[PDB]
């Protein structure tokens, strides 16, 4: 490559893997969203919450891909594994699954940051910090807040609590 | 002092003490606010309610300090004791603690007013009446209203009632 | 904690300490500001300069506290020690004290950054760089510029130089 | 009187005396203002500062007179004694004389307040607090600030300091 400079084959591979993880997360959120759109589930705010996450994760993948090309690396795509469930249970079940997913993405970001630091690749490290690391921390805090509120409500009386959370917290 | 007139050393000292009380109240409210911002507490309206009180109490202290200088007294600062709790329980626990705090501030204002009256210091007495005494009465009435509503709700079913109060009463 | 990830107990403690340092700095600046508001000191631009710093340091503490909750740490508050002086001398005395204070805050930031780096906590490191480290460097440069100008002026003729600095440099 | 109620002959007399004091203060300030307008004095900001005080003191007298009629008392006017000096010296001399004057007015207000309190006349006491007592405290603080600044400057080098105060502090 005529532009590649200080960009390790290790980081290039790891970025391609992280792209796959983000696209898989988007796919999971697509499935979550449409499950909550089912006539027998019917929680529109939950559907919207996950659909907006599907879009955010896809955008994250596209930013990674742009950066891959900016550095002179080569994007390589793999199969996207279907989401881990076909049906996602109740709002708390779904939000717990979302937190699990986000913590896995965050750990992948943290692992990639550690790799870039080992490889003395400060552009990579700055890229992750600026577009991904704080976005994850904010998102995980939001989901944790949501989970606490859902759990406070669905202890009290399950169906009613689920309805109220969707109506009064979610957009 | 070239400007000091009819301003007793007694009132000057008491004003410095009241400054400390107000700054301590601000600090208590800072702690209350961020406790309700915790991911495992997560009541945003309660957090906001106390954060706005933190600001109001700090502003009260600054008004007192301005007046101290206006009269030719000398501001003297002491340590600010940490708030009385590290964790603040449920919304009713917190609102009861807030009412306790405000009643202590109010009694300090009332004591200072009585001192000014004994000292024949009508400027002081007018200052307190105009900026502090009615502000306290209004705030304590609001907290009493809140407490009654919280108690009506958390008798019924605790978690749900707490959620509904935060969503439908608090900003 | 349901959200905590890659956040060391060491960093959590150090952040609580830094909160205390920032709130103490705010308190120092509160005292500085009102000393310059005294009828027998009467330098309004100096009062305003320090009052605005009081607000900036409080805001810094609140940002730290927000981040503590974002990461799943627990805010813990300690006593705030009173400022180191009751009377702050002349403008140069005060500005030298301010520079001392800021250098102590900066070193605490630098120490916390080093800790985060040792702990492989890139979010922390990015947080400090983005909101605190450059803010300190800019503030210390400004105070250094001020001190040089004050010293140029108060060599020439002390009272006059102090007046002119407050009127023509400070807001 | 068909409207007079709870208004002592003592307070009525004292209000007439206070009117005289305010009109005399206005007259003093008129003399101060035009002394600083002299071609051989020529400090326009000082002239303006005192001319605006002349107007404020006259307005204070008119408010007192309005209140006298509101309560059913009878305005009685006495000679206005000429001001105590024909020439007013330097800016610091003039500002010291102004502070002396204001402290005498303030003590007269405080004496009248004490009388109203003895006479159980809460309207009078509220009237003074609302329109006069805080106005005096603010004005005396301003003059004290001015005096400190003038003294800082005219120690350094008298003529220059006087010029700079008038140009950079006064309107």
Curated annotation (Swiss-Prot), chains A, B, C, D:
Fe cation binds at residues 52, 55-56, 59, 62. This is Ferritin light chain. Stores iron in a soluble, non-toxic, readily available form. Important for iron homeostasis. Iron is taken up in the ferrous form and deposited as ferric hydroxides after oxidation. Also plays a role in delivery of iron to cells. Mediates iron uptake in capsule cells of the developing kidney. Delivery to lysosomes by the cargo receptor NCOA4 for autophagic degradation and release or iron. Residues 52-59 are annotated as: Catalytic site for iron oxidation. Belongs to the ferritin family. It comes from Equus caballus (Horse). One of its GO terms (molecular function) is ferrous iron binding. Oligomer of 24 subunits. There are two types of subunits: L (light) chain and H (heavy) chain. The major chain can be light or heavy, depending on the species and tissue type. The functional molecule forms a roughly spherical shell with a diameter of 12 nm and contains a central cavity into which the insoluble mineral iron core is deposited. Interacts with NCOA4. GO terms for cellular component: autolysosome; autophagosome; cytoplasm; cytoplasmic vesicle; ferritin complex.
